[PDB]
Amino acid sequence: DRIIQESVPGKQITLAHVIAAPIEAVYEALGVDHEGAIGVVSLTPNETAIIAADIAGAAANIDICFVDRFTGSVMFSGDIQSVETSLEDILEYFKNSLGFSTVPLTKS
Amino acid sequence: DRIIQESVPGKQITLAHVIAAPIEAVYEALGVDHEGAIGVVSLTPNETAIIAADIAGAAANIDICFVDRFTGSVMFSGDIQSVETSLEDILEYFKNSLGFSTVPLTKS
Amino acid sequence: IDRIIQESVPGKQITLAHVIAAPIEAVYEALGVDHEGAIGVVSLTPNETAIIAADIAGAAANIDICFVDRFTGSVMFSGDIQSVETSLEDILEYFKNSLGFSTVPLTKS
Amino acid sequence: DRIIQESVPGKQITLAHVIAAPIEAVYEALGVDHEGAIGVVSLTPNETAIIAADIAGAAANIDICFVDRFTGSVMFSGDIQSVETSLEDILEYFKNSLGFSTVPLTKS
Amino acid sequence: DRIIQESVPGKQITLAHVIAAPIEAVYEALGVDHEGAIGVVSLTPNETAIIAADIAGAAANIDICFVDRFTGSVMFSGDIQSVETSLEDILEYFKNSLGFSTVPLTKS
Amino acid sequence: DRIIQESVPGKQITLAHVIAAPIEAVYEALGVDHEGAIGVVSLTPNETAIIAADIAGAAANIDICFVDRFTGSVMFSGDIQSVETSLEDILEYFKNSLGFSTVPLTKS
């Protein structure tokens, strides 16, 4: 029961989430402004975080908190509709123009 | 015996635990006040730690010790019923609204 | 040479439950601990369970936690060989019976 | 089911992308000159980033932003056709002379 | 072709090697004394590096260069027969008393 | 669709490459002397980087740029024939004396 597996990254968005009103401990632990909804994206390969941050900014009026190409994460802040618009555009671009597996937009 | 594996993160909570009465060494090696129960959460993708910390704080009177989006871990302190309430709300949101695989609430 | 998507999540297991009855001086210096006593070494997955295992180990005889590493899923402790074995036995018993984790036997060196 | 998996890296380019006109927060978050298109490459094994950066520079007159052998990533800037030429040459060399699995050139 | 895989570390020694007479660049890159043979061990789980360093010291007259519990590596120096003795004792203990998969002693 | 995978490192050289004449941006991003060909090696387990650096130096007149036992990478510089000789000797030793899976010598 031993097998060689050549490990490469898959192509998927695992999380596309909006936190409508984060608690103060979340703004503090994130080092961000204590206002606005939070957009959280999880992507593979990790390098696609730069593409998703570009789409998020181009889609709506948002403030990029971080573009992490080392963990494949993107965080941004703004009004709840601006944050949803960026998440929607990220999911639409990665599914329709990149052929990535995508999850639905989740809200909390 | 050789296969290419496209690696992506799964969606699951692997640990939702309460340590009812931690030992002074555990309080010390964590940089916390030497009183109250400890809530420990393990999540995948690692980005979901921010969501779980938000739900924990909104559910009950907790003190977030850390929100680690790099390791997908959350740790908080409070009374044993407050800590259990936050763990219960984390598990019920991730199962019912996110479709994540969840473990039961464990106590030590 | 086919291709398969693998959703990676951590498994639930203790991979090492070990006691070193009398470590050599170089082991104590690399660790940076008191130059006396047996060494308890635990390897756990998920890595967050290191805090739980430290608690349960500390819930038994004269233990000195050398480190609780939630980043690597490791726990180290120094005490008398029977105190160290007791801690290791309790960790294995709790994780198997109350957590449903796969466990290895207590090993001695 | 329980199986031993000998983990070795696979041989593939997972992302060969051009961001035609990045937003100012992308230039800022990258620490690069606020001008030109952005080329983004994801490779496995991570060591092949040095080979791809050498081919990118030899192919067109780009400006290498980073060659990351720790993450297997390459980022470069230049005119959109120079960036597309470098990406095309990287894909061509890796497929035809290295036997690596390659993705198509993507644009955003 | 999509599967959830619960990842845990396997139990094995992947390398038990002696470099009889290393070149000066190898002593330089390792930050070690420019004298003696080099013993190199690769182990999984990474925590077993402390066990293997204990056996290596107890088995023969060696000078531990590093005990890396973060990478699962052990490096030691000494006369070629002392280094071989330590490697042999590490392999014998891990196979017979731990049930780990082992490789043979290799020399260069 | 859930399987436990015991992860251990495989034994293979994934890249044995010579860049005959790197561009100045490559010498720069590497922090090396602006002269000579570049030898690039990718190995698993990561500890075998020390063995490969020793063989490279013993085989031909090369200057080790880095021996990375954390990433399993080796980089060296010298004349194109010295660099090819060292790559050939690493591939020969790892296949014939270690039983590692090897790739061919690639040139760019």
Closest residue by Cα to residue A102 from A8, A7, A40, A11: A11
**In angstroms, how far apart are the furthest CA atoms of chain F?**
53
* Nearest chain D alpha carbon to B3: D10
CB contact under 8 A, F10 and D11: no
Query: Around D105, how many Cα atoms within 13 Å sit in the side-chain half-sphere?
Result: 17
Collapsed DSSP state (helix, strand, coil) of residue A18: strand
Using the Cβ of A43 and the Cβ atoms of chain D, whether some distance falls under 8 Å is answered with no
Return d(Cα E66, Cα E44) in angstroms, integer. 16
Collapsed DSSP state (helix, strand, coil) of residue E98: coil
Q: Which of B4, B7, B22 sits opposite C8 (nearest CB)?
A: B7
Using the Cβ of F1 and the Cβ atoms of chain D, whether some distance falls under 8 Å is answered with no
With beta carbons under 8 A apart, name residues in chain F contacting E30: 50, 67
CB contact under 8 A, A29 and B9: no
Count CB atoms within 10 A of the CB of residue E71: 16
Using the Cβ of A44 and the Cβ atoms of chain B, whether some distance falls under 8 Å is answered with yes
Count CB atoms within 10 A of the CB of residue F3: 15
With beta carbons under 8 A apart, name residues in chain B contacting D10: 4-5
Backbone angles phi, psi at F25, to 5 degrees: -65, -25
Q: With beta carbons less than 8 A apart as the criterion, state whether F87 and F107 touch.
A: no
Return d(Cα E9, Cα E6) in angstroms, integer. 10
Residue found by looking up tokens 């003696």 in the block: E36
Q: With beta carbons less than 8 A apart as the criterion, state whether F100 and F94 touch.
A: yes
Using the Cβ of D13 and the Cβ atoms of chain F, whether some distance falls under 8 Å is answered with no
With beta carbons under 8 A apart, name residues in chain B contacting A30: 50, 67
Strand order in the sheet with E12-19: E63-68, E73-78, E37-44, E12-19, E106-107
| CA A83, B98, A70, A20 torsion-angle sign | positive
| CA C19, C24, C29, C35 torsion-angle sign | positive
Return d(Cα D62, Cα D65) in angstroms, integer. 9
Return d(Cα A85, Cα A99) in angstroms, integer. 20
Using the Cβ of C32 and the Cβ atoms of chain F, whether some distance falls under 8 Å is answered with no
Backbone angles phi, psi at F35, to 5 degrees: -150, 145
* Nearest chain E alpha carbon to F48: E15
Q: How many domains in chain D?
A: 1
Q: With beta carbons less than 8 A apart as the criterion, state whether E56 and E64 touch.
A: yes
PDB resolution in Å: 2.6
Q: How many Cβ pairs closer than 8 A exist between chain B and C?
A: 95
First-to-final CA distance of chain F: 43
Return d(Cα D55, Cα D57) in angstroms, integer. 5
CB contact under 8 A, F47 and E73: yes
**Long-range contacts (CB closer than 8 Å, 24 or more residues apart) made by E24-32:** E25/F53, E25/F57, E25/F63, E25/F64, E25/F67, E26/F50, E26/F53, E26/F54, E26/F57, E26/F67, E28/F64, E29/F50, E29/F53, E29/F64, E29/F66, E29/F67, E30/E65, E30/E75, E30/F50, E30/F67, E32/E65, E32/E75, E32/E77
Provide the domain limits for residue D50. Answer: 1-108
> F: neighbours with 3+ CB pairs under 8 Å?
A, C, D, E
Burial class (CB in 10 A: 0-12, 13-18, 19+), D31: exposed
